[PDB]
A paper describes a structure:
We have therefore investigated the functional behaviors of an interaction network hypothesized from available structural data in the [name] [name] (AP) active site. Nevertheless, these residues are part of an extensive hydrogen-bonded and Mg2+-coordinating network that also involves D101, D153, K328, the Mg2+ ion liganded by E322, and two water molecules. We observed three overlapping functional units, D101/R166/D153, D153/Mg2+/K328, and D101/Mg2+.
Residue numbers in the entry:
A (entry chain B), B (entry chain A): 9 to 451
Write the structure that this text describes.
Amino acid sequence: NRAAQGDITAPGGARRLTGDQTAALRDSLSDKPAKNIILLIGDGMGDSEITAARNYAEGAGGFFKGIDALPLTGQYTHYALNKKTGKPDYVTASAASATAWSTGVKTYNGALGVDIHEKDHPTILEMAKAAGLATGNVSTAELQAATPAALVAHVTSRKCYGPSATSEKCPGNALEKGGKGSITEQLLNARADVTLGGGAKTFAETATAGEWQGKTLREQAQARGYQLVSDAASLNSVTEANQQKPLLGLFADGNMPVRWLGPKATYHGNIDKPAVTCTPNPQRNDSVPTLAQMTDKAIELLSKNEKGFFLQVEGASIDKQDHAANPCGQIGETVDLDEAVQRALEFAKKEGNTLVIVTADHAHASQIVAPDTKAPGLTQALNTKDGAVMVMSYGNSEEDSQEHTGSQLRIAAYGPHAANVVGLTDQTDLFYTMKAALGLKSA
Amino acid sequence: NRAAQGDITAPGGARRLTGDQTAALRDSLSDKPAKNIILLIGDGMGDSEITAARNYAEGAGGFFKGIDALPLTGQYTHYALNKKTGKPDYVTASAASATAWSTGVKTYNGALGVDIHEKDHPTILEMAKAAGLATGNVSTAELQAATPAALVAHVTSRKCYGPSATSEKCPGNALEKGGKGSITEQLLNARADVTLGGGAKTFAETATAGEWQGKTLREQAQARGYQLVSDAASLNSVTEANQQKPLLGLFADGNMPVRWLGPKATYHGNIDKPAVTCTPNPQRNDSVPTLAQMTDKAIELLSKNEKGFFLQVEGASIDKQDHAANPCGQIGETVDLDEAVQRALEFAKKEGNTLVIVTADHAHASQIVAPDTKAPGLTQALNTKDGAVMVMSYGNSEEDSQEHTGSQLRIAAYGPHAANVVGLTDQTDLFYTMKAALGLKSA
Ligand SMILES: [Zn+2]
Ligand SMILES: [Zn+2]
Ligand SMILES: [Zn+2]
Ligand SMILES: [Zn+2]
């Protein structure tokens, strides 16, 4: 627990610590093997995003019971590479960074599972499966999106969702040109035990070559023995997931809907408009599973494997709402991820041999600024849990989409090998940290 | 060493880690008492600020030999309080934050060494002195500024620099009105062994009351046994500092000048103006000591105390140049601080009982964004050590001063009791962390 201990107005009332941590931290240092690993990613969830969410939902002296509860903490770098020069591109996006932590190799913006020479490298999920471990891959984004795709697809551009776009934009990857295929096709080949998110639309496409040509990717998946689920009840009803009967969850056409509604931030929004209170999204159908609900079934099913499992969970629409300059959406999805993180930590503490890691792919735009702020970008004032006004600014783009930022950001871990995120690290160190904790070996 | 291990374009080339860190971290953890403490403060040095400076000066896969070399890392919160309501004010400035880590109590923006009720609370420096330890207070800002002042003065507004402004803005603190006096006057009463910085301008004021009425504050310091120095040569000539002969260095009228020159960022600066390469500041002559030079002498002098010392070092102009939207100024002062930190770490490793801490009072405005970025605020393109462009954006103020931000930010530490910065903590925990490490007590 790291909430403020009492009266924040009085001596010692805002302390998050009750005593000395040296002994407690020594007991958090284990070098034994990790049987399991859970990696939780908030896209765009930099330190600013975390703090804003905490201030709003739990108050400034509050405490995220998931996100803030991991004891070993550091800052890590996530610069991408310029494809032509091989020099740092200081502001990454999902693909290059997901490639980075999943392969241990830097690459260029747009690349999935390939280096700057367009050459494939194996992913941590692929290596876990080879060693006999179960594998899970979960995202509130469409499943073709870069973060979940990176674990199961190798392509020259992240836009190559299905056969149609792959033939056009990844000619070398296309199936009818001898390549491994589209993101969705490769995801089906990768055959993770558990795969849950959105992105049903691309599954409507039919493959133009290969053993299942003329069939929709939906039909292919079924033909190859996958269980299809599309809402929370059916997901819940699933009792097993393995190589004979892998689980595919498709819970929306595109991205899964956000939990909180609020107005878009506006020019002089914190001056011209009144303080905003977030409400639940009334357009989110009740049958859509939450990130934590998806995480529950995943952990339940994957943990059946005696040898162990690897699971990745992505809170995606933190980035998306950050891009859209929508604090309520953005905070809402940070709250959504905290729930999922709680599930993973609850499992991990009971099981005793699980490494849980929580971080983001890169920083983003949202900044917490003073209430009187008069800024050139998009701003909005919110009513927090404290009963006080917080203002948020998005001031790095004139166009309709607010931009990523290149600042280093928090990485936190719990369990075996958690030490390897403390201090300054690079995103690629996370690959090798995970590789080493599971005792995995290159083919 | 946490630099990129090799060729950043190849597998494992961007790794900052050479192996498992568990055994290394176990060694780093000591609960024995700290004999000395060095607290280094980069004013406004958020994780964005650290990253931008590293990217520029050392390249993306580079490594600050001071700043990035502290092994025990975390994230801490620095929200202030609204004076009337006692609820969090989410974006602090230096007075409230410096007051928080120096007293262990939160307070309102503008308050120095007092709580929201205007009650005085003792500072870590005052308590150190009381216990017999030696005390140092070093800054590139004018010494009246909130970060160094917070250790030695208790006033209701940080603007109460000297008698003149105190009578008007802190009438209850004014000396002629029964109070302890202006910041400068209370500083002279506090009588730290070592006090180095700018702010000579205010010492030209005369006191309106008390034992040294009619005399200038400079004359007062002379009469009370202080050694005054005004340049690097004289500073170096000083052989001892103690309560019989305290040292006061005044190296500029106001703030000490910055190392690096570069143009101010502008609207569409990264588009319409060429990439910038920082140069040395021609109007900072070498007779003005650097922060590391001041840190050297301070460490030399204070370390002669058998019982131990407390030293605070502030790189003030990271904040100032961040406000002025000047990447070169801002980055140059971040480099300036890294040197001072190196001096602190070198001493700490040899001595073996010194706790060193590096952090910032709060986050700031500067953001690292993509080169093609088209932002509404002030931007600039810069040529890095990597031979690639990094753009910086300042997008939270339409007036002539870019604003702080509330994001939690990095705290790092080395030595005895350094475990207490790991995980999430509050800026006030830092007070209690330092107090316990030295074993200090209350009256
Ligand atoms: Zn992203
Ligand atoms: Zn994004
Ligand atoms: Zn400051
Ligand atoms: Zn400032």
